[PDB]
């Protein structure tokens, strides 16, 4: 039985120290770490016992009394954004390796939005003229997007966009509504947006 932060954030291309607490561990219980990337099965990262282990992606640092451990990703990339599970498979000599995944730690990796250009844009449907969509884009990681307080207004969580040939990353949220009368100008009212968010009309 282990306890870890419910979630954790970091910058891309930075070290990330995922912590785990295992108060009641056996002198002979292995520490194991697994991660599960969005929409994929879980994968093994690393395990250890008393001495510190190394990959190749990760290092494992076990405290001197072994009551806690840190998983260390040396250089986190976007692809590292996953749920991180700290498991004690042997469970004090009572079990044989079936995994009791915890709740885990949810790790979000943020792009380093170095030159932000916050803006809300309106996008017409190519087929039908009437149907519309709002895109909030090019903001940095300091900005949180909220679900708007309205049932008929849909607002997505931010996604990171990776334009690999131009070494360029961007944040976005997409907003659209049932209502024939909703505006992009107010669409992200339930968020604290940059004071210089560009509004074209």
């Amino acid at each position: 039985k282990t306890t870890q932060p419910n979630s954790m954030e970091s910058n891309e291309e930075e070290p990330v120290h995922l912590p785990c607490n295992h108060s009641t561990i056996s002198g002979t219980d292995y520490i194991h770490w697994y991660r599960q990337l969005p929409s994929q099965g879980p994968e093994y990262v690393i395990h250890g016992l008393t001495s510190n282990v190394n990959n190749r992606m990760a290092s494992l640092a076990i405290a001197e009394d072994r009551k806690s451990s840190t998983l260390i990703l040396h250089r986190a990339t976007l692809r590292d954004a996953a749920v991180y599970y700290c498991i004690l498979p042997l469970a004090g000599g009572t079990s044989y390796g079936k995994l009791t995944f915890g709740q885990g730690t949810i790790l979000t990796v943020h792009p380093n939005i170095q030159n932000p250009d916050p803006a809300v844009y309106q996008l017409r449907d190519s087929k039908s003229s009437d149907k519309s969509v709002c895109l909030f884009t090019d903001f940095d990681s300091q900005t949180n997007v909220s679900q708007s307080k309205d049932s008929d207004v849909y607002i997505t969580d931010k996604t990171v966009l990776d334009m690999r040939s131009m070494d360029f990353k961007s944040n976005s949220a997409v907003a659209w509504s049932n209502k024939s009368d909703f505006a992009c100008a107010n669409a992200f009212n339930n968020s604290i947006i940059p004071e210089d968010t560009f509004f074209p009309s």
Partner: peptide, 15 residues
């Protein structure tokens, strides 16, 4: 549905 790029986005960011 596919939603076409904003004009202002094109002028402003080149993207």
């Amino acid at each position: 549905a596919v939603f076409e790029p904003s004009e202002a986005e094109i002028s402003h960011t080149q993207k």
